[PDB]
RNA sequence: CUCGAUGUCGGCUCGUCGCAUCCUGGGGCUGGAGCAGGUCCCAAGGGUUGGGCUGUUCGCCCAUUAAAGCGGCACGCGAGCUGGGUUUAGAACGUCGUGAGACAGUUCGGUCUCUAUCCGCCGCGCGCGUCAGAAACUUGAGGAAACCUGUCCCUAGUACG
RNA sequence: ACCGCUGAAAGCAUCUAAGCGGGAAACCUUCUCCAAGAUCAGGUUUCUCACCCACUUGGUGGGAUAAGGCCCCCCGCAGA
């Protein structure tokens, strides 16, 4: 949550985002990549973004 | 229909907004004024002033007649004097103006001096009969307050200020 | 505003008025032996005055002493107390060498008196708090002079912060008010105070105007 | 596993708040999280980890007056009474910091961090603060998304 | 004044008013003054 | 809940608290003329006494008082006190019981244990820190103690009647 | 609590929703006292303000000294 605030974006989309993206990645390894190499959280999160639709319709 | 009623306004030397702020001035003191900021006020082709809020929110009613009273009524203090008349209905009593104020005692001890406030007229009739002047209702009607509950007016045979009438009370024999 | 001076007290006597009326009288000591050193608020907004009064040897006086009073200019003394003065300004009012006497004093004037109160040493409440004692004959086994009962039992499990109970008592900052000063012995430094001071004979007092009147 | 717990590898920065027109409760929220650390991806609740909150201006801060006049606050001594109620009107009047510490304390945890917390807080009611040597670094509340 | 858990008019020259959330009467004639509570 | 034990009434002593306030204080209304007085609202900051008789609570009474308040806190407090009554064993009158004996009916007498470890409290110290080591004077955030009241005179025997 | 100014909602009225003022032994300043162990441990002033070894120069120990204080001693109407 920390990082990807950061990067301006909740928690909440960034895991439905990854889910969309079939990135089953687990939250160990997300987490630490945050600290590794934010910039590979930042390109993760440019990825949720890409994949989450348009808005909270349905 | 208060809001309808729009603003003469005979004088205008500085009638003017700055600011959310009516600044007045005229024949007598000058006066200002902070505008409740829900309401928009405007000056008119004919130089009256316009109040109005056309939203939907009863509040913005009751701000809009208010303000609308309130910038009539600095008009109208500004070019006509407010005067409230008060006279005394008693015995043992006379009005002295010692140094720059009116001395009352309805038949006890230390006289009691109003506390004047800033910007404001008084003046003496008669013995038992005397008026105050200004620009501003409530400091015209502060003193109506500072004289009233000195010495409760009983509704027996009377012994204070009244307002030439109020239909005031009356004892019930003995 | 406070006008004050340092004296001691050395013990008390009667003398009689005008009027054919006795007046008690505590002698407190406080002629020209009282000098100063100002702490204006400028610099920690305290606004008072150091009153220095007594007598000492110049070699018992320690080295910071006798630096901050040399750097003032002053002899030593003994006793050292700090007098506030009023909330306002001040300024032009003392300085560093302006001498004190009595004879602020004028002879009627009505002042407030405090000091280190005489001792009295670990007592119980009898004396400390004054209890209504327990009675000494039907059956009281051990109870004379005791404090009995406090609070309730079960639910008020503790005993109330605060109760009077066995200490000490004395050698406290003790403060009478309205004391009418009778006479300022002007020609020897003598302030006669109607009334009682705190303190021991040989004690230290600090008298002050008083604010009531 | 954890990479960011371990002695000095903490940046303590400053942060600058102006307290004006924000509401108490939302200044004091982000003062704790931003005070803790939760900001950082580098969070340890075990050991005192965050940057340094700096209130300005907390006189300004808007309540209402229907809490200034009702929204009593109580210090009880230990003594019998002592129950020293005291409105938030008047300290806000005398002692605006202390409400504003106490709305943050509130917000705190209770326990031994929470003081060490306490210690890297410095509140100062008027605007002009003379802690210039250190970098100051204003900072303004936000939303993210969603 | 008549301060009770009821309220009702003296007679008809009178007005039922809410000041500060509390009802009260006033009836041009001190008999009452009654409050709602 | 407590029978391998919470020791009960009343009274003394010591406090605390509520306000459904006895007085003081601030007001409204009145069939309040004034003094007084009825009722109602606000208010816990103090005070709320001293005696006779009964073991008392509860009551009665005299005399004072601005006033002689209602209750909680194990029907406050017995590891602080009393042991008069209640509830031990003795004895007697009455009633019941053939009787032994009983009566929340009465009458006499009948021990009230503990060297204070902890919590809390009350007082005073030792140590360490308060970023070099020390000595003086002090701001006082924050808390405590105290917070009562009458008589007389003047206004004035005035206003009112 | 009560009384009240100005004046809407609702052409009036109204102590009121903006707004102003009066208003009690209660509250808080004010008067007295403790108090910086108030660990946010304050502030002002003043004095002393390189002295020698061991270990690994630092990191740390040991010994001594200035200001000053303590111990011991003579006393207190200060005190277990």
Redesign the interface.
Known sequence: ???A??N???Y??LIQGLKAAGVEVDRKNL??I???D?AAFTALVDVARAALPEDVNA | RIGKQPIPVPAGVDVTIEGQSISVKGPKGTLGLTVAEPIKVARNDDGAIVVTRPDDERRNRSLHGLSRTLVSNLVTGVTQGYTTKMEIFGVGYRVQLKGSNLEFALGYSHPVVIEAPEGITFAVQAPTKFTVSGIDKQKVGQIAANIRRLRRPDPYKGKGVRYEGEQIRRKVGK | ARKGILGTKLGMTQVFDESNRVVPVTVVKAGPNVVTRIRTPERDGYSAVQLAYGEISPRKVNKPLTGQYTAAGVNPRRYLAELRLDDSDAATEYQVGQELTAEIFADGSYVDVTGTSKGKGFAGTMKRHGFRGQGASHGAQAVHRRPGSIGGCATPARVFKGTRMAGRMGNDRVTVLNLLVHKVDAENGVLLIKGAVPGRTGGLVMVRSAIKR | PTYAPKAGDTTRSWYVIDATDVVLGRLAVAAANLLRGKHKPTFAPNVDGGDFVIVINADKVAISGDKLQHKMVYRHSGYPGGLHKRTIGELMQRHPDRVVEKAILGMLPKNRLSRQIQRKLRVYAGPEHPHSAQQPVPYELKQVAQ | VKVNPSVKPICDKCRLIRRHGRVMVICSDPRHKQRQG
Request: net charge neutral; hydrophobic share 45%; proline share 6%.
């Open positions: 949550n920390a990082a605030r950061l301006d974006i909740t909440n989309r987490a630490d945050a600290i590794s934010p």
